[PDB]
Amino acid sequence: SPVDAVLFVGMSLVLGIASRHLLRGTRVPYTVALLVIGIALGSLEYGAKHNLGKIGHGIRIWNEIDPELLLAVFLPALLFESSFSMEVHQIKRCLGQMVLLAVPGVLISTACLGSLVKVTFPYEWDWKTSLLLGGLLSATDPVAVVALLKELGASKKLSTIIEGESLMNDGTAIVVFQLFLKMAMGQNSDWSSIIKFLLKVALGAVGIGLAFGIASVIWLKFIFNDTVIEITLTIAVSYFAYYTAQEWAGASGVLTVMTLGMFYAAFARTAFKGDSQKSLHHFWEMVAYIANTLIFILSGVVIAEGILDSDKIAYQGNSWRFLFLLYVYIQLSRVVVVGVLYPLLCRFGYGLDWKESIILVWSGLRGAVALALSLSVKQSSGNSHISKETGTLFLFFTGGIVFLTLIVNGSTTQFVLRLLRMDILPAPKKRILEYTKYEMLNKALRAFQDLGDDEELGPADWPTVESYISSLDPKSLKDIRMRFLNGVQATYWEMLDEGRISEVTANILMQSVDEALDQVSTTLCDWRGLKPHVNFPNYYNFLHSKVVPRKLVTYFAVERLESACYISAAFLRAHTIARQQLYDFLGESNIGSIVINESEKEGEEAKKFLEKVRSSFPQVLRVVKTKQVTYSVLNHLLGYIENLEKVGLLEEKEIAHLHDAVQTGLKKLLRNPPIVKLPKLSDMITSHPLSVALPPAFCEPLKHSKKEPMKLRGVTLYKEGSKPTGVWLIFDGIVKWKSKILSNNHSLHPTFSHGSTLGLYEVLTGKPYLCDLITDSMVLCFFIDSEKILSLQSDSTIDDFLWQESALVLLKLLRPQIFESVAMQELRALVSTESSKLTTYVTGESIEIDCNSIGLLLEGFVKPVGIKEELISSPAALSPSNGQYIVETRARAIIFNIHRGLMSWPENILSLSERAMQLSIFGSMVNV
Amino acid sequence: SPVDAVLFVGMSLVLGIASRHLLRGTRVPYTVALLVIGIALGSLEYGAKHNLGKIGHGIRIWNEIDPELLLAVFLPALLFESSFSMEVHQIKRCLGQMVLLAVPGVLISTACLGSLVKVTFPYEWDWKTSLLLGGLLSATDPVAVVALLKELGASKKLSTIIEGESLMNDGTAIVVFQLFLKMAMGQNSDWSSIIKFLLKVALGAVGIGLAFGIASVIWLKFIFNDTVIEITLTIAVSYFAYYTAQEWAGASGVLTVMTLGMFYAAFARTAFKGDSQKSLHHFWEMVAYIANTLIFILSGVVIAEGILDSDKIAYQGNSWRFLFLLYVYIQLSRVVVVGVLYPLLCRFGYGLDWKESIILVWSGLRGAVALALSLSVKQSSGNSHISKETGTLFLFFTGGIVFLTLIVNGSTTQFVLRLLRMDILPAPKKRILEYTKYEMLNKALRAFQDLGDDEELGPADWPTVESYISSLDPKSLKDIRMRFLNGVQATYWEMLDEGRISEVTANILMQSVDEALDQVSTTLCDWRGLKPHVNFPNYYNFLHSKVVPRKLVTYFAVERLESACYISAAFLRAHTIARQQLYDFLGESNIGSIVINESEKEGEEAKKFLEKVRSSFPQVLRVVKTKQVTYSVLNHLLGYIENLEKVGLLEEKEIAHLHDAVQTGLKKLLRNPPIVKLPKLSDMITSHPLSVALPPAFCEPLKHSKKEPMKLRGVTLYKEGSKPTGVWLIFDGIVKWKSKILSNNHSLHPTFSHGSTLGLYEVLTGKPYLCDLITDSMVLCFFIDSEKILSLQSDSTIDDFLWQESALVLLKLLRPQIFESVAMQELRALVSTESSKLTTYVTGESIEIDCNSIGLLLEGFVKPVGIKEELISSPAALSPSNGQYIVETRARAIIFNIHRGLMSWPENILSLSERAMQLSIFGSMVNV
Numbered sequence A, B: 001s002p003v004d005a006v007l008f009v010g011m012s013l014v015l016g017i018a019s020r021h022l023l024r025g026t027r028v029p030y031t032v033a034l035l036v037i038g039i040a041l042g043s044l045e046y047g048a049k050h051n052l053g054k055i056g057h058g059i060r061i062w063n064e065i066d067p068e069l070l071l072a073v074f075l076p077a078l079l080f081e082s083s084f085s086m087e088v089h090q091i092k093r094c095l096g097q098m099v100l101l102a103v104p105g106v107l108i109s110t111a112c113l114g115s116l117v118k119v120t121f122p123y124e125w126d127w128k129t130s131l132l133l134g135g136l137l138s139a140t141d142p143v144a145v146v147a148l149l150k151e152l153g154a155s156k157k158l159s160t161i162i163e164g165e166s167l168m169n170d171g172t173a174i175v176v177f178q179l180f181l182k183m184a185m186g187q188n189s190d191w192s193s194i195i196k197f198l199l200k201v202a203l204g205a206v207g208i209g210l211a212f213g214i215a216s217v218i219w220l221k222f223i224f225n226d227t228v229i230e231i232t233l234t235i236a237v238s239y240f241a242y243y244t245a246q247e248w249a250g251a252s253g254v255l256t257v258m259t260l261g262m263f264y265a266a267f268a269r270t271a272f273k274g275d276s277q278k279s280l281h282h283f284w285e286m287v288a289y290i291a292n293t294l295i296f297i298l299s300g301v302v303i304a305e306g307i308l309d310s311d312k313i314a315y316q317g318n319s320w321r322f323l324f325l326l327y328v329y330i331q332l333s334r335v336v337v338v339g340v341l342y343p344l345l346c347r348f349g350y351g352l353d354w355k356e357s358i359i360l361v362w363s364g365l366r367g368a369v370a371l372a373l374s375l376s377v378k379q380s381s382g383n384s385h386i387s388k389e390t391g392t393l394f395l396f397f398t399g400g401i402v403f404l405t406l407i408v409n410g411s412t413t414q415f416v417l418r419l420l421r422m423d424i425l426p427a428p429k430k431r432i433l434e435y436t437k438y439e440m441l442n443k444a445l446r447a448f449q450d451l452g453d454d455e456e457l458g459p460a461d462w463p464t465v466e467s468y469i470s471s472l473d474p475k476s477l478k479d480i481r482m483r484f485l486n487g488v489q490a491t492y493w494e495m496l497d498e499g500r501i502s503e504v505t506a507n508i509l510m511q512s513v514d515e516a517l518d519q520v521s522t523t524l525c526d527w528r529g530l531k532p533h534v535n536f537p538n539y540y541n542f543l544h545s546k547v548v549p550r551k552l553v554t555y556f557a558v559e560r561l562e563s564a565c566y567i568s569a570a571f572l573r574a575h576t577i578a579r580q581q582l583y584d585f586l587g588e589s590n591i592g593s594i595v596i597n598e599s600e601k602e603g604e605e606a607k608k609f610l611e612k613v614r615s616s617f618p619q620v621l622r623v624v625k626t627k628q629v630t631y632s633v634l635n636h637l638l639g640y641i642e643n644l645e646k647v648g649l650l651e652e653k654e655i656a657h658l659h660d661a662v663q664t665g666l667k668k669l670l671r672n673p674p675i676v677k678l679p680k681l682s683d684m685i686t687s688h689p690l691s692v693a694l695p696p697a698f699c700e701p702l703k704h705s706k707k708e709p710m711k712l713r714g715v716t717l718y719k720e721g722s723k724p725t726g727v728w729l730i731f732d733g734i735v736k737w738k739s740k741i742l743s744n745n746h747s748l749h750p751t752f753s754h755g756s757t758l759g760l761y762e763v764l765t766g767k768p769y770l771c772d773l774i775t776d777s778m779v780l781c782f783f784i785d786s787e788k789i790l791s792l793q794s795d796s797t798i799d800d801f802l803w804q805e806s807a808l809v810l811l812k813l814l815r816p817q818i819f820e821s822v823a824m825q826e827l828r829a830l831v832s833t834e835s836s837k838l839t840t841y842v843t844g845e846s847i848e849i850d851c852n853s854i855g856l857l858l859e860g861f862v863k864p865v866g867i868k869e870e871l872i873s874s875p876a877a878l879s880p881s882n883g884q885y886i887v888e889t890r891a892r893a894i895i896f897n898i899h900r901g902l903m904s905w906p907e908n909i910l911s912l913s914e915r916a917m918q919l920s921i922f923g924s925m926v927n928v
């Protein structure tokens, strides 16, 4: 007999799947179909009293459910996914509005609804019962609202506001529901008892949720490679926190589960495995789906049971009159709440104008949370406090309100949104969507070439493949700003793809750019959306508060400045890249220079933050950079291991060992910031590329002590035109170079960084300093005298290397139009290639610059052919004029063999053998 | 009060997580800890009668579980993942052994155990009760055995055998358990009733499972983009099939759920979404985990309850004596089963030698299925048929046997496997593992370069990244065969990565190569493992049986020859590629030629199968190739959309629309083979690259009728030395070319394919046919006369194109050392480039062949410089001798600007500026 509850669950799930599948893209939630199906089924079982056989047995078994078991099983299932899929950064952006719409919004709605259904309803209810109903059906469902917002097409700001207030209204409304339910149960008669009950049920529930979250997050941090226990841990901790709060501490288990889910959303994005995230979210979304379906069908069944009893509440008239009165009361209470909070709602978080206010009012969808609360009231009814007729009325009214709100609100808020002209996609977003569709076309055609060379199967059919994918200026400052922001977006996309930034950092940066794309008429506001995430509050860790460890200080600083450092570095890198790209796309136009200077002025707060990090905490950026690099490394290893697993190339014991090793490395990363040894001067010397030339005897004068490598920002390294007093080794930081003498035209990013030595050209030649260096950051720089460098010129193997270093520096100096937007590791690869040749040239010879190569004069004089006799100075960067140069004096030279379309998309995009190629690859012809 | 069952579930889950986490890499299943914990907890609640408070309330609630509700909730949860994660191709490889170990193996074990516990046990049991116990504890658990095999390290053959027999022993043993349980309930007294009960409970259960599988698979095929209802559909169909079989049809719900899971494993790999697969498998594995944990803890609790009752079965002595007797009876019965079936087990499927037989005997792990069956017997005990003492004895004995088997078998089968020397990894697999680790090192270092250029954060710390990844001839015919098979493996990996083959096809091919890597001493046996998957049984569809539709015939042929065509084409392509690669790695050694000829002889059955497909069903390969190409295209689009979703670049409504479109395209693909229009002669002409030269007036002589494009294999197209009677257009198929006159040295793959026209050089010049063409397949070839081609020489825009086509053909003819292993679409790109120049050269001029380019003489004579005067013929392929050529007569020439390390891994793998580069990127220095 009890096995028929399994049948009830199975048939309810099948009906839920059928309703969800049939009512997709219909404006009509499948939940109204579930409620109607449950009501009809309960009418068959109870009103008409037909023989449903084993169907009716399960129906009756589930109708005899315990109220408190009902809540304990279903409410965590409903609410955990809503609270856990919460995205933390949009919530921190609109949290003032969230709490405003949650706590006082629910309080005002409860007051209005309770007063109205007290004064008007004919059931001679109490104030306790009236306010219990008011606070019951004051909880906007997060599942229904999220499902509505998926297909609604509203803006991200309004979608975030509505979703967050919907998921917090549940907590507040269930708190007040428990308060007034205990009141109706003859408790909480005094104000002091009210305060104690609220204090316990709210704060203790939040504390239990936080404690369980902390314990489970630490446990997850110590669970390395197991994606099954990571999800069953969420199940166990959720259903154990609910029990510990409701039964053991007497708190609110719902608030405990919601705080647990929010703690998981905040501090457990790195506690779970990366590939365990999708499975865990899918499982909890499915559990919410199953709980919602079961609650809707059970609520329908029990409504049919209760309103077709001896009393026949369904044939009383007053039931329906006051059901529609209750619906208009819902609408008026939501209007009152939004209007009262509007003067404060429009000033906090995201701006709320009158258009978003109408959608906020109209998206008052009631769902399975209110249904579950009223069902628990109905199932516990029949005693002296809440009569059976009253509990049946509560369930009937709540079910009718859920039905009416869904039908008249989910189906009509799309109309209200298309009206008021809030569904229109703005021009930058339309351009971006067209670019993405164009790139998808390019990917499809490229995949079609890559598989067109098959002799066994033959040729494919392009028309069929197309059928399956058949659903895919320089003077205006506004458009140039829009192109620049598109370039910044493209650079963020590129660095996310290459692994330089994580998905959360990428989302934050992309959201900032999307915000900035609406103010392209005014100055670039790209950093405005990043300012909330980049803050440096205080550094009291150096006031002896935590200098005794000196060891936890790095931990708190890194955990406290990790995401901000990533955001600042990514912002600066993307702005530099997009600035260079906009210079290449526009060339020399004054509007391009205006936007370039705008970006340079805007990128000052990020540099100031990075300076604060460098000064206050000199070791944090090393740890942060190391963590980023090894995180990307381990993700690349994970991708490789996933490909190995798919192909089945390795033994399942060896590939499992590799997977365990990489996943353990990732968990140990995201558990604890890397313990990076702070480099002294000795190991910074030995890690500099100049150290191969410097002998170990010169490397150990007390490990080159007595000099602090730190140089403050704005400190000149050496003045231009000065004598070669020495060279500078850049172990870290940024140095700017200025030179009016040098042909520094259009040097957009004059900069040298770590692993660079500056001044070798001058000390090796004796010529005055070619450029003016000033430190642009906290530079870890060491000075070695020219005597030490010049004394190294004994051997010819070291002279070659020193002149190649000089070649590097002058390549980034003499020719910055090509070699400034390249790393000085790629440039070292270019110079260090065996094909590159350093040559001392006797007077009267010729230098062989040619096609597909470049050369740079080091020391000497050269005169060309076919042009008026010119005495070219020693630094020349000798480039092919024709795509010549008799050696004049004793010469030195070395010859080297030397998503990005979003900025310039609809600009950067025949023969009788080109048409044949299209025929040979494709079917007839396609405009590739 | 009933809310305490939620507490029981939560604490049981927490204890299960703790046991699984603590006992990882311990040889000890966490399930023994679960059983011990449950026994101790039940002892506290029932024996010692301590006040456990709300813990004991949940304990007692779950102790009062219904037996049949217990089975209905837990057995589908346990067994669905085991039956659904079943891999179909290894099962079809060893199915004879599977059924042999499942049906008669379980029958023999049941007979032995029942007879032994009837004759020896002191409880005066019946034959019905004795055989009920024997068939209860005759079900080897699939969950425990799978978990053991994950860490065991046994071969794939033995692992597959053990896993499959374990997951089918459950079906057979639960069938016999239901039979003998109904017998003990006073039923099935006659042989005819026995036959009817077996017929119903087995065949009707299989039929219900098949029907539910068919319905749900069609439903899934019509569910496009919803990964949540796709998993809750599995839940609903599983728990509805169980109910429909057990309660409505009276069949076995367990057999129904297992056949449903096997149907999902077989015919629903394409019914679910690709990205829904991992989430669905994770969910069902977690459900099996939760059910197993709950069953073990509940079984412990109820054992403690039953053996500490008034009877005190735990203090009787006989309980323990016959528990250990029952364990030795388990061991002897398994020995008897394996020994009796060995003469047949060693001849069917995978060979079973005496070493794998010992592991087969010893891996007799009993688990949660036997525990659940005995718990259902215990919970239903207390009546006249099965006494309370008997049911308690059943549960106690089954729990003790599960405990003893786990402790003494899971912990010691690793020892038994390391003994007998079955844990040693063979040399080819060790080499492959070392190659994978080397490639992971290369990936890690490359990811370290790609993020070393950061001016804001600074430099990373390579030692830390390394710390996080610190766990990573030409004369022997055997080694050359091993290298060739490694090259075939690498090519399979490459085509899986590029999307030419799916993951199932890749797994089949890789398994075939792994099998072949053990017989490298003998001839290449790569095709031996593919022969089971490549069969062409019959084609009665053309005997008027189904020619009336002519429309379903393609559907059945494609669904029936899809995977076989993929396997054959991939095998032939990979063998051609690896043959060319082995020629490049070895050069000219006779051993390399021996292996090359071995591969060519081996690749004949695949070509014969493709010929059978081409002859019998001329339209199937077009459909199959189109489906493959569009599947890869849609997967690439999915990857692009996933990257778009991660970055948050598009609106969540537009990106959702793109995702829905691509996923709908994929579901419509895997639902129905593409409807590819069979090309007539007219559209094949218009789709050939020669059709741009051919005017529409020449294209429509009744759409060029009266000629059938089909040419049988072995039909010569034109003989060498013959007059240019015409040219041939290759729309499909393969043509081989032979020419002793031409310098065809080391032409390893002489072949032209679709989109190629052959003979233009001869008709344009009048020279005799340079090579001998014979059709190597069913070629769709058209003949156009030389008069039509020569009459096209009026314009100079068409002459250029015709001579460029001739250049293509002669590039693949004159110079096959470079241009035969390239598509004739890439070669068309090379020739059609604006940098390529066709030139008519007046007598006495010079031709400018240079570096980084190639040239080919078309028509005329040429004499070189510095070598004895040579009169080079018209086809020359004029290549730079120095890295010259005075035009002799009226000349024609055109000048063109012209995982793979697995085969040659530990063979294909400083300066003072190279050491500095390592310093500038890394920390000190790493051997890159």
Ligand SMILES: CCCCCCCCCCCCCCCC
Binding pocket: A005, A009, A061, A062, A064, A065, A066, A073, A287, A290, B235
């Ligand atoms: C006493 C009346 C019946 C009470 C039923 C208890 C609630 C059980 C709900 C189980 C839902 C299972 C589906 C979960 C799939 C992820």
Ligand SMILES: CCCCCCCCCCCCCCCC
Binding pocket: A073, A074, A077, A239, A287, A290, A291, B002, B005, B006, B009, B061
């Ligand atoms: C007397 C009836 C007892 C019922 C006990 C049910 C315990 C289930 C707790 C965990 C359920 C989690 C999944 C819920 C999905 C809707």
Ligand SMILES: CCCCCCCCCCCCCCCC
Binding pocket: A235, B005, B009, B061, B062, B064, B065, B066, B073, B287, B290
């Ligand atoms: C009447 C005694 C208690 C019977 C309990 C019914 C079985 C409910 C099992 C629910 C398990 C929920 C966990 C599923 C999570 C995926």
Ligand SMILES: CCCCCCCCCCCCCCCC
Binding pocket: A002, A005, A006, A009, A061, B073, B074, B077, B239, B287, B290, B291
């Ligand atoms: C009187 C007690 C009724 C209990 C009904 C439980 C129904 C649950 C059916 C579906 C359970 C699926 C998940 C099981 C995971 C172990």
